[model samples]
Target: MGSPIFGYSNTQQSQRVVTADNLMYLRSGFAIDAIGTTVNNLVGGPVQGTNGGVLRAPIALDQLQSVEVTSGLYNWGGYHIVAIKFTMKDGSSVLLGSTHYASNKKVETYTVPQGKRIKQINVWTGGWLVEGFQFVY
Candidate 1:
């Protein structure tokens, strides 16, 4: 018999909430703002609500800043929850935060520590539409 196309793995590609015990933190910073583009086709075509997908954005890390996630969930009869893990330019990553998705919009924010630049923001969503995102310093 032949081997499988994909190798075995120890990690599950699903999204889960970041419990308080497993919470991660970073230092606070100033108040400024920046914007990044949104790509909805990380997994090919638009990311559906029932399915999970990975969303990422490229950003500069020179200024201390904060990130805000504005999203909308397509309610197809079940509860919606989306979690995200933020990664910085220095390769330091953490489960920044998560949010409950409803018919309306949900917003979650994370601040970047001083001296640490954010090269990218990765979002591992369980079920929700990432309407947009912003970087505020």
Candidate 2:
């Protein structure tokens, strides 16, 4: 009983993975916009890893940047995978780290190695309500 934004049928507020075939690309940028400040509470708590620390999501298939096709040997051989870690920013709460990707229009691309069985991307945080991410060229 509500309206859907961007012609998207809201998925009832849930964590989802952005894929290339899904067309979930955001403004051209290389970052994952994680909610901050009081908004962070809405997504639960700070994302954490199983090792008693902050959580980190794996790089998306699209998040992978492309390697410079310098030589044919490196061409289509391996990709560049960019690993990211989001830390808490202290404003209203105690943040473990201060590294975060704002909701900007910059996309980060990683080049994933070919012939690899890639499964899914992983993220680490307080398990919060994330908006979306984009991988730019």
Candidate 3:
């Protein structure tokens, strides 16, 4: 006669969802898996499923602690963005600083007192492409 159960007693078995308790465990397992996936992605994989490529879009200011404007590209009408504005998390705006589009320059540094949590960044250019930028955090 065949044994009552097919699997070995010491073998790892898949957790089956048959009871309310089982369902809860499964849900928690799924949540843990999701958190792990997100952390892995942020470190070396795609963030939010979008691959962070060579060109980076405007990210949340908090995400980028500091910003630097490198150079200007594609000037139009004798105007290029030389100023950067920071919008704080508290819905207030501050004009950090400006420099001619000649070389890389530090725009803002996240510091206490004068500096607060940043929300968004706006670039002011009359007719040129703000070429490069860096964030230090």
Candidate 4:
């Protein structure tokens, strides 16, 4: 025996593409996901990329409001990056690199204006560690 198939109780059970009529929930924020403006200029590896591999780190930020970077002196030689962070518009923050065992030192920060956004970022990498960075808006 089978049951009658008149209709289902809800319509959202399947799926629906976004449209003007059904799209009511709206969200707003800016995301900073990369250091360079383009793939060719990505801020790491003078070796940038090669036939066998590529080197790039992606930062996924949903509401980037500020940036902070820290550096440290290495045991053998010069200063190198210890960590990095991104602050959200909501007043919260996240660390970009290693949070532990860093010879940690000075922290520099840049906060964006309320109505503005970050356009690009650049960095310096020595060997396998970050040396410094620049932010553009």
The residue pairs in collision within model 4 are: 45-48
TM-score of each: 0.29, 0.22, 0.24, 0.51
Give the range where candidate 3 is weakest over 10 consecutive residues by summed lDDT: 26-35
lDDT of 2 by residue, 26-71 (tens): 1111222232112222222233442112333332333332311110
Q: Which residue runs of candidate 4 sit more than 4 Å off their true CA positions?
A: 1-41, 45-62, 75-77
Judge candidate 1 at residue 34 and give its lDDT: 15
**Candidate with best TM-score:** 4
**TM-score of candidate 1 to 2 decimals:** 0.29
Candidate 1 residue lDDT tens string, 33-76: 11122322231113345333333333334422444443334344
* CA-lDDT, candidates in order: 0.31, 0.24, 0.24, 0.40
Candidates 2 and 3, the one with greater TM-score: 3
**Of models 1 and 3, which has the larger TM-score?**
1
Number of the top lDDT candidate? 4
Judge candidate 2 at residue 89 and give its lDDT: 21
Candidate that beats the other on TM-score, 1 or 4, i.e. the better one: 4
